């Protein structure tokens, strides 16, 4: 049949260790590649680029298999603005600093002062005078779920799929659906992301597919109609 | 005479073994490269505007067994978890839990296992013994009388399908499927690429 | 759950040796990446920090190189003049204080050199320029101010890097999470690609390499908060 | 204190052969680069990339160090269009050819004819008929500047300095001036211009900077406030 | 049989958030337009159109009344009206004579500096004085001269603010026009046009210089209805039923 | 032969599927246009080459009318006409009973009559007021101002809906105009324009201005014939044969 | 010398294909426009504009005539014109009276179908007959009723068709206008402007409006000649010479 | 209440850096426009919008005055007025008769050069003569021939220099107009429009043509206030003060 597809392809994932199928959602960009070359002659090389328009922790976690920690204790930074110095060359904080705090004057020179339990911190005359705006930076203990990376390792395997919809050209109707079956696919360790201003991130997730054991299948494409 | 080409190029496929002529008049480009290395210069590239499996099959080395069931993955949405006690999913699963989530006052979904009939193509790492014949057909406009006099033909005897297949699937912009070949020198004439122009007044 | 973000980061810089907590600014771009290389064994995991700030300061690239800045240092810099008019006596007079040989440019592109003279009046050959001609001159002028120079090698400083951003709920378009990224000790790089193009901010960039931690053996920690706490 | 800069640079070039300071800058873009080598890993190569809005022969001349000898007669091509063939098939060319002359008809044909003392050129009837129009091309000598390129003579050491202003981010005035004077820079041969329609060529000149023999310095940054 | 319509349509908007059926006013014109967007698909030799993915069928609305009202702009930008708000507004006073002592009395109640202008032009800002009499410099002007005073005074009225946020209110537009039979000379039918699920976009524009065709312009945008998927609907209503 | 035309031309419509010959009527304007695009500079010393790409050649149609036809807008937006369908509409009344009673007895239809109005600048909102021939609405006093009333009325008639239903009907268009000999003041020839295999567009713009005619406007696009590859045909002949 | 014009120039066209000359007839309005692309060069300290750079001129054409015929309608579509061809055109028949036998006689030569319309608006479809007598249904019409009929007829004339692929040929354009003396108002000189190596473009638009002619306009595009590097020349005359 | 406006808008200009209150004039015409633009994110199947939006707002201000003022022109750019300064301007002389001595007398003060133009358009150039008499060759003109001359004359007056490098300061604009009741034919209220923190924008165009005034325009850009986050305020007053 000579037909056309237009839109993207939904991804689907498989779990085989215990069985829990992730990705009850959709994505934005999914591509395909095939290059043998490599004149011990080359057998097969394949790459996958699944690219969604959202951001979820599990889709960075599945690159390097680690447990998703619960709300634990982590040390993170903090900042304050609009702190005025009183007539007594002192200032009080509104947050809860845990570590040493630093004050930056209008010109830019800094000042390191240890933690004061009362909350009010003396301001040296050389650093600043009365009625002077001040800023505070300190470390704050915030509870929340935790994730990190650790060296290079191979981890849990997870399959992929390419599911899209077809259109009948001459009668502009949904004629068929296309599914690409990828067996024995393991997640790749190359995860790269970028952070800009006024644009989406489009996170990059890659995998690679290994050949099947008892069927010798690595790349299967299935086209299924809708009239049966 | 000096002229200018305006149109695309028609492409015909002929097998050296038996030959099933398949053609198309709807294509984007019919481009062949040229380079010297140590020489390989007859790399080709044709970009179409219509989806098919035959050409994909041509790129690969296998059939498309029809009327077969393998597997499929599909999911639903809507109101799934409700009525306090348990849930009830609608479908044909192959491969409850009131807790661990909202107490049946939300919409939580899980993908289930289905299957259906469809075509099957296997990408195998063998079966590269196919030869082909290709031919181009484009027109050239005369820059003096605003008419076409000579039709330009490019044919590549002894061509082989290169083991390359790059395609990109994106949103509602375009598809542009690609199939590329590679032609070597012929046996009895040592020819791999020739270009021929036409003449209507003959 | 899933979320989207379009804002910048809140990168903070601190030095391992001391308690310096400088560089809290509003940057433009920020990213990190990893790759796999070969020599024998690969056994590599490299993180290359990137950050571009819409502000310029010599302190920003101070730690990119070694040594330290020099304050109130006398330096010699070039200066040029144009629009000078030569009198009918075939002489010129500038209003600067040159300390080097002064070159003269005519309208035909020819160059004439005359050493600096205290009298302030300099003669010109008639062939170079006739009477009532427009001449331009270049010379050298001493100045005082900040001076910074770069050398080879001498990289020993270590820093901790923190990345901050705020998540957005796709449904309500409001705050849902705060994505925090923390880095262990890092080392300055030796790459800096800046350009002062026409009518667009230079936006200098800083690059860092993250090494494995001594005790925790970590390289990148991603922390996420929420309004629930 | 942090400022914002957005402008080009006023660079000057000086050579050590005779202390020949030349040229005042009216350019488009400028930049400098540094990196780390691998083979003696510790090495900071300095590359210069400056694009100029105007064209100058000397700018190409410094790249290929050679003499600038002028008033040299050269053999350059000239094309004559609009010639009309008479019935006598003997037409005197308007120009003054010195090399071989070739005629071309509407269909496109070639006919080499030697120079004529009287200037009248015979036209074969097979080439074209009467009242027809043909074009001619030949060489005409002309005087002007001449530049040559050789395969040797790599010498000369230049000096490059930069100049730009620093706009204060709150008073909308130049707070300071920035100087990026580079000592002991050497020519690097790489310049790929392109002349097209609707775009200036913007010639590019690249340079390689080396450290001095006494101060071991290759690149300095100078900042001086405007209030001094 | 057929008919011809020459009259405008009575315009009604009903808010969808609450049961607010208001703006029962008569306007001077009303219109709506329907357009489609084509993207097509290049084919080849020159017979390029092969298959088109036509979608995004949209309908625009237009209405211009012959009266001005502070009520008929809140649909453009979601906001309320603040009444009895103390606001500061400028004012101009003319025909202020100056006595021989170079002093001028004021009958207004300034709340800020007062600027005085002489015959040709000059700026003289002076702090407000409770007595109401202000001295005049000799260089400013001479005696027996007319001056003008400009200053700021508070006022009370209905104040409305405009911002860029909170654009969610939906409405329902209903038309009503009469149809004339072509060969009997009385009314024949009433034509009503309804636009469910219409989103008010902001294309505010006005030119206040005289009474020549004020025409406060309000522009609306129609969007898809959820349970019916019918962007617009026309109704023919004969007078015999 | 040289001639001049100054009048209109009747419009002939036919359907490809069935054999109806709808709209053997007349109008005031009926125009069609050709669209051409592309062409490049392709400079070099500022010279100009062939300056063509030689594709496209679309044909658009534009037909107005002097009367309002329901079948016309039904035809440009092919759907089904719902005869004898109940619909809801608004209505108003002005003056029923003196207001110095706080008693109002609306007449004509009691279904969904709400949201009365004050007479100067306020909203005399009764909120819900649906009751059987109620004569005791209190709300606010508003003694002897005007009264005012707003209703909701149920009526029946023709019903038409607008939605993206993928119209695909094909048509044939024929024209007929009369020429004029510029010498003897007589109709020299009759000119006809043939537009086989023409499909309707989705452009529907009209306005309801103070005093004018509706002149409904829809567009058509002519596609090349599958056999002869023609979309526009010009034919004329004189009445002497 | 110093003069102006206030008259519309005449038009002359020559086919550059072999030898043909076209349209030696008066026109009502002529025009031509010259435009060039625009860029700008920037650089230096402060982004001062140091130079101006622009090229790639292009010139358009415009002509309007108060007369219409297909000979110059084929100007934008260059093809031969076939004469005396058998074509099918429509026909409108009115004043049809049915006798007491409930049958209607026909006057004409129908080709494909005959359609009947009653006075009230309902349409009737009947098979085409040879005698011309049709038994009208009693419900549709009774005895002594006014009917109308529409049927296709055959005519012979000169036809012109628009092909799917486009085609154009280079042409020559000539202008002719006379200047007026600055003070004595005599015809000082004549002005002629020649456009070698030009081709038309397809943007035809005929409005079939009533009360006045459509005044057809033909759109041409200028092109640079490759012979002597010129594409627009204007020549003034001298009545003394 | 439904109210009709009948007058212009009063304009008040105040600069933020100082307390100046220039241009208390009545102006001729005032207007302002508002537009809304936003972008959305795309997703998966069907290319449905993801309903994540980035919206921004902007407002343009337009005013028109029937009068001309130098400081009104200087208002656009950030430059001050330069007082009486020596400047050079051109001048012409008409009706010059050359004597039999091929000389002409001049009643002007040339500073650079004097050029003579004859009736035939010939041009001659000669340096300034101290005695005011110039020598003209007989070829240019014979004795008793009419002549005209053009030269440059020094002038002294206030100067303005428009600069393309300087622009600063912030302004605030207030409006004022009267509102007419449609029944009592009396001013019911008055409307003021305020634009705090409005940035001047340079879009200046004035037409100097034959007859009728110049009516200069200045456009403005409005930014939200850093404190209240507002760009415009609409307040309706009343005659109850």
CB–CB contact F51 G221 (8 Å)? yes
| Chains G and D in direct contact, meaning 3 or more beta-carbon pairs closer than 8 angstroms | yes
D11: nearest CA in chain C? C78
For E18, the token pair is: 């609450």
* Phi and psi torsions of H106, nearest 5°: -120, 135
> Which residue of H39, H44, H53, H56 to mutate against A (max A Cβ within 10 Å)?
H44
The verdict on F73 touching E (C-beta cutoff 8 Å) is: yes
* E68, E214 contact by CB (below 8 A): yes
d(CA G10, CA G7): 10
Listed residue (G61, G71, G7) closest to G34, CA to CA: G61
* Phi and psi torsions of A67, nearest 5°: -70, 145
Chains that touch H (3 or more CB pairs under 8 A): A, B, C, E, G
All residues of chain G having their beta carbon less than 8 Å from the beta carbon of residue H121 are 1-2
| Chains A and G in direct contact, meaning 3 or more beta-carbon pairs closer than 8 angstroms | no
CB–CB contact G121 E1 (8 Å)? yes
User: E2 to chain G, minimum CA–CA distance in Å?
Assistant: 9
> Which residue of D4, D7, D21 to mutate against C (max C Cβ within 10 Å)?
D21
Breaks following residues of chain C (C-to-N distance > 2.5 Å): 39
CB–CB contact C138 D223 (8 Å)? no
* D111, D101 contact by CB (below 8 A): no
Method: cryo-EM
Q: Which of F50, F53, F54 lies nearest to residue B143, judging by beta carbons?
A: F50
CB–CB contact E47 G164 (8 Å)? yes
* A157, A186 contact by CB (below 8 A): yes
CB–CB contact G50 D82 (8 Å)? no
Listed residue (C218, E27, E226) closest to A66, CA to CA: C218
Q: Which of H45, H47, H50 lies nearest to residue A10, judging by beta carbons?
A: H45
Cβ neighbours of D128 (radius 10 Å):
20
* H95, H146 contact by CB (below 8 A): yes
Dmax (CA) of chain A: 86
The verdict on B173 touching H (C-beta cutoff 8 Å) is: no
CB–CB contact E53 A4 (8 Å)? no
Helix H or strand E segment including D59 = helix D57-63
User: G180 to chain F, minimum CA–CA distance in Å?
Assistant: 31
| Chains E and B in direct contact, meaning 3 or more beta-carbon pairs closer than 8 angstroms | yes
F/G interface, count of CB pairs below 8 Å: 143
B30: nearest CA in chain E? E44
| Kind of pairing between the strands at F171-178 and F10-15 | antiparallel
d(CA H203, CA H221): 11
For B78, the token pair is: 């809507």
Residue window 139-168, chain C: list those with CB within 8 Å of chain H: 168
Listed residue (D28, H120, E183) closest to G41, CA to CA: D28
b/e burial code for range G160-185 (CB count within 10 A of at least 16 → b): bbbeeebebbbbbbbbebebeeeeee
| Chains D and E in direct contact, meaning 3 or more beta-carbon pairs closer than 8 angstroms | no
| Residue E114 bridge partners (DSSP) | E126
Q: Which of G41, G45, G56 lies nearest to residue D53, judging by beta carbons?
A: G41
Listed residue (A165, A186, A176) closest to A13, CA to CA: A186
For H142, the token pair is: 């014979």
d(CA A80, CA A94): 9
Helix H or strand E segment including F73 = helix F70-76
Task: Specify burial of residue B85 (Cβ count, 10 A radius: 0-12, 13-18, 19+).
Answer: exposed
> Which residue of F91, F208, F210 to mutate against E (max E Cβ within 10 Å)?
F208
* F30, G208 contact by CB (below 8 A): yes
The verdict on D194 touching F (C-beta cutoff 8 Å) is: no
All residues of chain B having their beta carbon less than 8 Å from the beta carbon of residue H42 are 171
Distances (CA, A) of F178 to C98, F3, G64: 92, 10, 21
CB–CB contact A53 H45 (8 Å)? no
| Chains C and E in direct contact, meaning 3 or more beta-carbon pairs closer than 8 angstroms | no
User: B4 to chain F, minimum CA–CA distance in Å?
Assistant: 10
Residue window 4-63, chain F: list those with CB within 8 Å of chain B: 49-50, 52-54
The verdict on B171 touching H (C-beta cutoff 8 Å) is: yes
G45: nearest CA in chain H? H165
Q: What share of chain A is helix, strand, coil (3-state, %, to 5)?
A: 0, 45, 55
All residues of chain E having their beta carbon less than 8 Å from the beta carbon of residue F201 are 36
Q: Let me know the angle formed at the C-alpha of B5 by B2 and B8, rounded to the nearest 5 degrees.
A: 160
Q: Which of F19, F234, F237 lies nearest to residue G155, judging by beta carbons?
A: F237
* D63, D191 contact by CB (below 8 A): yes
CB–CB contact G1 H165 (8 Å)? no
Chains that touch E (3 or more CB pairs under 8 A): A, B, F, G, H
User: G75 to chain B, minimum CA–CA distance in Å?
Assistant: 15
G42: nearest CA in chain C? C198
Listed residue (C192, B121, C32) closest to A222, CA to CA: B121
User: G26 to chain E, minimum CA–CA distance in Å?
Assistant: 38
CB–CB contact E53 A6 (8 Å)? yes
Q: How far apart are the first and last CA of chain E?
A: 16
b/e burial code for range A192-204 (CB count within 10 A of at least 16 → b): eeebbeeebbebb
Listed residue (C194, C192, C57) closest to D30, CA to CA: C194
All residues of chain H having their beta carbon less than 8 Å from the beta carbon of residue E211 are 4-7
Residue that has been written with the tokens 């200009």 in this structure = H13
The contacts of residue G207 (CB under 8 Å, 6+ apart) are F29, F31, G214
All residues of chain C having their beta carbon less than 8 Å from the beta carbon of residue D169 are 55
3-state per-residue secondary structure call for chain C: CCEECCCCCCCEEEECCCCCCCCCCCEEEEEECCCCCCCCCCCCCCEEEEEEECCECCCCCCCCCCCCCEEEEEEEEEEEEEEEECCCCCEECCCCCCCCCEEEECCCCCEEEECCCCCCCEECCCCCCCCCCEEEEEEEEEEEEEEEECCCCCCCCCEEEEEEEEEECCCCCCEEEEEEEEEEEEEECCCEEEECCCCCCCCCEEEEEECCCCCCCCCEEEEEECCCC
All residues of chain H having their beta carbon less than 8 Å from the beta carbon of residue E214 are 4-5
Q: What share of chain D is helix, strand, coil (3-state, %, to 5)?
A: 5, 35, 60
Q: What is the DSSP letter of A145?
A: E
CB–CB contact H44 A200 (8 Å)? no
User: F53 to chain D, minimum CA–CA distance in Å?
Assistant: 20
CB–CB contact A10 H42 (8 Å)? no
Task: Specify burial of residue F40 (Cβ count, 10 A radius: 0-12, 13-18, 19+).
Answer: exposed
User: C162 to chain A, minimum CA–CA distance in Å?
Assistant: 8
């Amino acid at each position: 049949m000579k037909t056309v597809i237009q839109d993207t392809a939904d991804v689907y994932f498989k779990r085989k260790s215990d069985g829990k199928l992730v990705f009850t959602a959709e994505a934005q960009t999914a591509s395909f590649s095939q290059a043998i070359s490599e004149e011990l002659k080359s057998e097969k090389e394949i790459n996958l680029t699944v690219k969604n328009a959202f951001f979820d922790l599990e889709w960075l976690a599945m690159t390097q298999g680690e447990t998703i920690q619960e709300e634990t204790k982590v040390k993170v930074f903090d900042r304050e603005h609009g702190l005025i110095v009183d007539d007594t060359n002192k200032v009080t904080l509104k947050g809860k600093p845990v570590s040493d705090v630093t004050f930056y004057n209008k010109k830019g020179l800094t000042y390191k002062i240890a933690v004061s339990t009362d909350g009010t911190y003396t301001i040296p005359t050389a650093f600043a005078a009365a009625k002077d705006k001040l800023t505070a930076v300190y470390q704050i203990e915030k509870v929340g779920r935790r994730l990190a990376i650790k060296a290079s390792k191979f981890s849990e395997r997870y399959e992929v799929e390419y599911r899209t919809i077809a259109y009948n050209p001459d009668t502009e109707e949904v004629y068929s659906d296309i599914y690409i079956q990828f067996p024995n696919v393991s997640p790749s360790g190359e995860f790269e992301m970028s952070l800009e201003n006024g644009n989406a991130l489009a996170p990059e997730i890659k995998f690679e597919a290994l050949a099947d054991t008892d069927t010798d299948e690595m790349a299967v494409v299935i086209e299924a109609s809708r009239d049966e």
